[PDB]
Design a protein around this ligand. Structure first.
Ligand SMILES: *[C@H]1O[C@H](CO)[C@@H](O)[C@H](O)[C@H]1F
Length: 559
């Protein structure tokens, strides 16, 4: 059975592969089928054993948090050889081998997706995807939870922002298809997220069930257009997140009551009515992480877990208390919250992706050790430099004669770090590098914290005697469970003397900082805070490299 699913896009399995899926399915107990539904998270901290993911059930997949590539490779061998059914092994490879709170600790940090989008060259996104999948597959990853095809409509949203390809649906489609092309070259499944679409609300689904409140027609013309394009392009998997679309839900079910409207991860109207029905998506649907507030607050958990599967999800991403969660699935199956027929259909789509990857027939469980040499390879580092060269964007340049910088125009610089990270020693490694590279050019550079500021004992004339230029290094990065990535001062260090001392503002992440420093006359978006982008920033400030980036978003955010 299931030939109508498994023989067509995005599965395209052969007769013999479908026979393996069916024979395997029939051989599984209900407990084993329920376990296939679960992806378990894995971390590398002493006292934590990866095989703990198998103490309470036999999972269908795992996801690696960021730890070292060599440990990931060892974990893959241990996990797979201990598993009767091969595992899907997922990773949040968002920005290359490393970067963005996902990936691996020591992979290549290429760029944020928005930095890639600023190049306006889809080859940049293809290269991004190649790095992610090339470095991931070397250590055993076969599933990247990317690309993000959210639209960065709302500039106050803290969980979209540089994780997106910006606010233009046509560019999102171009870039996401290219990212997927790069991944398929290395045998890694992709995941379009976050369905039904982040970026309309200004709130984080990590902390609540956020709401895409476009009209049904508006949603269909934007998010629906993007999802349809990636589905037709062959997207293998899709992540249903803890976001509501009430107006689309009511289009499917006009009589639904407000309290019955569920987020994507729990919604039959969105997963079965829209995705399976209207869009004929035939790939694997997984939930976003189930311990997040957007999920937990929407429904009692014991009902929610089987209901997600019944309503169209094939896989639950992560457990809270694993004994309790598995018991909830067992009881949901026995009492009819989850049907045996829907259980078999979910597991068929899980096993089908394992057969698509040819995991059952793989003699070795990881590639040869030789494959590890791709990680931080010269090719990958080179692509990161090219993308930085093409991405950095001169947004506002209303300071006559400021650029290019020269020690003979502005010898003494005060460097002002602004960030929501908490690096040991107070200063970001990348800002230290930037400071050192300015000094190499011949500038004298002090941190804001090292020199006096105007006050009862120090005047603005003193400041002007001691300071020729202020430079701001702003890195307000996305991170789960933040309600803002707005500029926060750590407010005397803000650009409060722009008419008395020339001030230059550099953002290495959030592209909307003109919201909080509108007085600034020269403003540059770099989208990514890594070594490659810092070095290329220096080249461009000194006038040895042109500014080539094009804003993939409106950096002024409506003035
Ligand atoms: C929910 O969690 C999953 C697994 O880490 C991420 O891929 C999604 O971006 C997040 F929304």
């Amino acid at each position: 059975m299931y030939e109508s699913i498994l023989s067509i896009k995005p599965y395209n399995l052969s007769k013999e592969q479908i026979t393996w899926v069916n024979q395997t399915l029939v051989s599984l107990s209900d407990d084993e089928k329920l376990g296939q539904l679960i992806c378990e998270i894995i971390w590398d901290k002493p006292g934590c054993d990866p095989l703990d993911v198998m103490k309470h059930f036999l999972p269908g997949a795992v996801m690696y948090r960021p730890f070292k590539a060599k440990r990931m490779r060892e974990f893959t061998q241990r996990l797979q050889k201990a598993s009767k059914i091969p595992l899907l092994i997922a990773c949040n490879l968002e920005r290359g081998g490393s970067g963005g709170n996902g990936g691996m600790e020591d992979g290549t940090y290429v760029a944020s997706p928005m930095g890639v989008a600023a190049t306006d060259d889809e080859s940049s996104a293809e290269h991004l995807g190649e790095v992610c999948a090339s470095e991931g597959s070397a250590v055993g990853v076969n599933w990247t939870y990317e690309p993000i095809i959210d639209i960065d409509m709302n500039p106050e949203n803290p969980i979209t922002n540089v994780r997106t390809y910006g606010s233009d649906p046509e560019r999102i489609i171009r870039m996401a298809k290219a990212y997927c092309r790069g991944c398929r070259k290395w045998g890694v499944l992709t995941t379009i997220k976050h369905f039904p679409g982040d970026g309309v609300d200004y709130r984080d689904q990590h902390l609540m069930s956020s709401v895409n409140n476009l009209s049904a027609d508006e949603w269909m013309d934007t998010y629906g257009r993007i999802y349809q394009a990636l589905i037709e392009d062959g997207a293998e998997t899709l992540m249903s997140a803890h976001i509501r679309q009430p107006n689309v839900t009511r289009m499917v079910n006009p009589l639904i009551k407000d309290e019955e409207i569920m987020p994507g991860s729990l919604s039959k109207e969105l997963m079965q009515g829209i995705l399976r029905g209207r869009f004929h998506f035939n790939g694997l649907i997984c939930t976003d992480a189930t311990q997040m507030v957007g999920y937990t607050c929407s429904m009692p958990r014991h009902e929610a877990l089987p209901t997600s599967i019944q309503n169209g999800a094939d896989m639950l991403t992560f457990t809270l208390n694993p004994t309790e969660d598995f018991k909830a699935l067992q009881e949901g199956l026995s009492c009819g919250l989850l049907t045996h027929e829907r259980l078999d259909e979910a597991v068929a789509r899980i096993l089908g992706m394992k057969a698509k990857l040819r995991l059952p027939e793989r003699k070795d469980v990881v590639p040869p050790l030789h494959a590890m040499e791709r990680i931080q390879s010269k090719k990958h580092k080179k692509w990161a430099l090219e993308i930085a060269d093409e991405s950095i964007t001169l947004v506002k340049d209303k300071q006559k004669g400021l650029l290019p910088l020269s020690p003979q125009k502005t010898k003494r610089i005060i460097l002002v770090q602004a960030t929501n990270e908490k690096p040991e020693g107070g200063y970001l490694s990348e800002a230290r590098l930037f400071k050192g590279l300015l000094e190499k050019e011949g500038f004298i550079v002090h941190w804001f914290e090292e020199v006096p500021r105007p006050g009862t004992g120090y005047s603005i004339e003193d400041l002007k005697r001691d300071t020729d230029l202020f430079i701001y290094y702003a890195n307000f990065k996305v991170s789960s469970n933040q309600t803002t990535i707005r500029l926060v001062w750590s407010g005397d260090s803000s650009p409060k003397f722009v008419c008395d001392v020339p001030t230059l503002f550099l953002s290495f992440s959030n592209p909307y900082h003109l919201v909080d420093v509108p007085m600034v006359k020269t403003y540059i978006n770099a989208y990514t805070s890594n070594e490659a982008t810092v070095r290329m920033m220096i080249e461009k400030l000194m006038g040895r490299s042109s500014f080539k980036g094009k804003s993939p978003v409106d950096p002024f955010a409506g003035l």
